[PDB]
Write a protein that binds this ligand. Structure first.
Ligand SMILES: Cc1cn([C@H]2C[C@H]3O[C@](c4ccc(C(=O)O)cc4)(P(=O)(O)O)OC[C@H]3O2)c(=O)[nH]c1=O
Ligand SMILES: Cc1cn([C@H]2C[C@H]3O[C@](c4ccc(C(=O)O)cc4)(P(=O)(O)O)OC[C@H]3O2)c(=O)[nH]c1=O
Ligand SMILES: [K+]
Ligand SMILES: [K+]
Ligand SMILES: [K+]
Ligand SMILES: [K+]
Lengths: 193, 193
C-alpha cells in the first residue's frame, strides 16, 4: 500500500489566516503582516523583525486556548484527504508537530481531526517533532526544510504551497502541490508500483 | 546513529500498578486481578471476563483525569533512558500510543515526560497508534503483537517483560529485555555497525 503523510498546519488547517485574524483582534494597535507579504516559514521571526516585542505577541496567539481547535480547514483539504484515504492500496496519516507549549495544542489537534474526519480517523494521527523518522512514500508539508534524526527519509517531500513559500525556487527534482484543487492523484500515482 | 524507540506505558511508566491501585480505591467492593495474575495485554479484557461490567469500570480508571500524569516510573527506567540518550551515536524517542479518549492522555504524557526527563526531551516524543510506520533500529515495548500499516517494520522488537507477558514463549529469534536492570547496553550494541 502507498503511504502518504499529510501535514496539518498550513496544509489541512488554515494556521496563517487564523493567526492573522486573532492577532489583529487582540493587538489592533500593532502592525501586522498581510498574508500576501508572508515570507519564511517562521511567523514569529517575521513579526520580530517588524517590531520589538512582536515575536512574543505572535507566539501568544498560538499558545492561547482554542487557537488550534478553531482553525478553519483549507479549501478542498477535508474532501481531498477523505477521498485519498478511501482509495485502494492507500494509507493516509496526518503527521503534525505540536508547538512547544503542550497544554492545549495536542488535545485540540485530536479534537479538530475528530470534528472534520470522524472518530475513526484519530487512528491515523502521528504527533512528532521529527518527521524524518516516520516512514512513508510521500510527505505533503508546507515547510521547505524538513530535517531530523534520519538523514535519508524514505518519503519524497512534496511542498504544499503557502503564502510564505510560494516564491521559492526549489532544487530539481523537488516538486509542489499548489493547493488541494491541484492534481494530488497524479502525484500519488507517480509513486505507485 | 542507532535509533531506539522506547514505549511508555508498562516500560517507563507503571501503568499496571497505577491502574490496580486506583481501581481498588474507586471500586473496593469489586474483585480485581493481582499483578502476578495478569495475563494478556489488554487489562480490560481480563477484567471483563472476571465479572460483567468490569471492563467498563476498568476503562473508567484510565480515562480519568490525572491517571497518566500520576503514574510512577518503573524502577531504573528514567535513569536508563537518560543514560541511553546521552550515548554517542544513539537517538532515543519515546513512542507511545494514547488511548482513544483524548481529553487528558496526550497532554498528561507530555507533562510526564517533561517532569521526569526535562523540557528538552519533549522533542523526542512520538505519539502514534501505529508504531510500524516509525523507523528505527530497536523498539522496546511490552506488547507482544505489534502490527500496523507497515508489514516489515525496520525495527527489531525487543519485548519488555511485564506481568502480563512474562510466561510467553516467543518465536526464535525474538528477544526480551527483562527489566531496566537487565543489560540494555548489550542489546543496543548487538545492532550497531
Ligand atoms: C513553534 C513555532 C511555530 N511557528 C509557526 C510556524 C508553524 O510551525 C509548526 C511547528 C511546530 C513545532 C515545531 C517544533 O517543535 O520545532 C516546529 C514547527 P508546524 O510544523 O506547521 O506545526 O507550528 C505551527 C506553525 O507555527 C512559528 O512561527 N514560530 C515557532 O516558534
Ligand atoms: C486502549 C486500551 C488500553 N488498555 C491497556 C493496555 C495498554 O495499551 C495501551 C494502548 C493504547 C491505545 C491503543 C490503541 O489505540 O489501539 C492500544 C494500546 P499502550 O500501548 O500500552 O499505550 O494503552 C495503555 C494500556 O492500557 C486496555 O486494557 N484496553 C484498551 O482498550
Ligand atoms: K505546516
Ligand atoms: K485506503
Ligand atoms: K505498553
Ligand atoms: K545521543
Amino acid at each position: 500500500a502507498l503511504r502518504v503523510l499529510v501535514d496539518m498546519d498550513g496544509v489541512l488547517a488554515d494556521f496563517e489566516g487564523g493567526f492573522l485574524r486573532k492577532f489583529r483582534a487582540r493587538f489592533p494597535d500593532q502592525p501586522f503582516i498581510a498574508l500576501e507579504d508572508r515570507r519564511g516559514f517562521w511567523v514569529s521571526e517575521q513579526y520580530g523583525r517588524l517590531r520589538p516585542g512582536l515575536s512574543e505577541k505572535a507566539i501568544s496567539i498560538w499558545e492561547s486556548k482554542n487557537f488550534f481547535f478553531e482553525l478553519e480547514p483549507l479549501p478542498g483539504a477535508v474532501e481531498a484527504v477523505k477521498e485519498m484515504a478511501s482509495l485502494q492500496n492507500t494509507d493516509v496519516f496526518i503527521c503534525t508537530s505540536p508547538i512547544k507549549m503542550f497544554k492545549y495544542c495536542p488535545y485540540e489537534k485530536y479534537a479538530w481531526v475528530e470534528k472534520y474526519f470522524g472518530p475513526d480517523f484519530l487512528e491515523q494521527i502521528v504527533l512528532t517533532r521529527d518527521k524524518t523518522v516516520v516512514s512513508a512514500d510521500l510527505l505533503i508539508d508546507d515547510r521547505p526544510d524538513i530535517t531530523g534524526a534520519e538523514p535519508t527519509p524514505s518519503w519524497e517531500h512534496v511542498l504544499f504551497t503557502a503564502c510564505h513559500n510560494q516564491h521559492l525556487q526549489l532544487q530539481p527534482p523537488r516538486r509542489r502541490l499548489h493547493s488541494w484543487a491541484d492534481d494530488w492523484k497524479a502525484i500519488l500515482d507517480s509513486k505507485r508500483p
